[PDB]
Amino acid sequence: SCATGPRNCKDLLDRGHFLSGWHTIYLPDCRPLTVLCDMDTDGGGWTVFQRRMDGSVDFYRDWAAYKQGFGSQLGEFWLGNDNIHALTAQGSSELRTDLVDFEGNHQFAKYKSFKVADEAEKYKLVLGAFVGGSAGNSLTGHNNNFFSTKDQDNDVSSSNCAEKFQGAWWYADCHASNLNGLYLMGPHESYANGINWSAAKGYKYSYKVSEMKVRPA
Ligand SMILES: CC(=O)N[C@@H]1[C@@H](O)[C@@H](O)[C@@H](CO)O[C@@H]1O
Ligand SMILES: [Ca+2]
């Protein structure tokens, strides 16, 4: 039940669940949700809300799709903006971004706090201090920006960044990171429309694996 159940993946780690996988947790309003726990990376206990690996799932989707979530437990997914708000409402959550290139190199970025607001505030990004990591810092530039999709433009550009750049993100004018962009498979000639993290591999290289995840601070 909600009374005795886990709130997040750290609670599950503490209860002796040591392998990564899908588990039921209870949101602050006691609604049950099935989530992916990363128990292996950097001490474990992370709740994963985005995962790319192979380009099998189309990420160029509308407001509705990003609001509710889409994809597969067996592969690539976005957990859903309503879900991500709920998960980050209580206490304080640290953010980790894990990346792998096609040459086999693993890179990461960590932030000391992370929250997204409710739909009334367009799922606005509230981001704390950059801690470090081999991937460098390409998200601070997005702090305090609304979320935008192709059919709903909340960015700070006279243009439509989500359409430019073929993704969905807390776009500014327009981005330093674009992890929901096209699965372009390494180097690409088109500018800034792939799975890009500009502080590491720049605007013309699309990563093999991307993963975004949270843990109580
Ligand atoms: C993709 C994106 O937004 N790229 C911009 C680019 O268009 C230009 O404005 C530059 C100037 O500092 O800053 C970024 O690299
Ligand atoms: Ca705009």
Swiss-Prot record:
Glycans are attached at N196. Residues 1-217 form the Fibrinogen C-terminal domain. Changing Y191F: Abolishes interaction with all sialic acid-containing glycans. Ca(2+) binds at D153, D155, S157, S159. Disulfide bonds join C2-C30, C9-C37, C161-C174. It comes from the Eukaryota. Residues 208-217 are annotated as: P domain. Coiled coil: none annotated. The fibrinogen C-terminal domain mediates calcium-dependent binding to carbohydrates and tethering to the cell surface in monocytes and granulocytes. The domain undergoes a conformational switch at pH under 6.2, and looses its carbohydrate-binding ability. Homotrimer. Interacts with elastin/ELN. Interacts (via Fibrinogen C-terminal domain) with FFAR2. Interacts with CRP; may regulate monocyte activation by FCN1. This is Ficolin-1. It comes from Homo sapiens (Human). The chain holds residues 110 to 326 of 326 of the full protein.
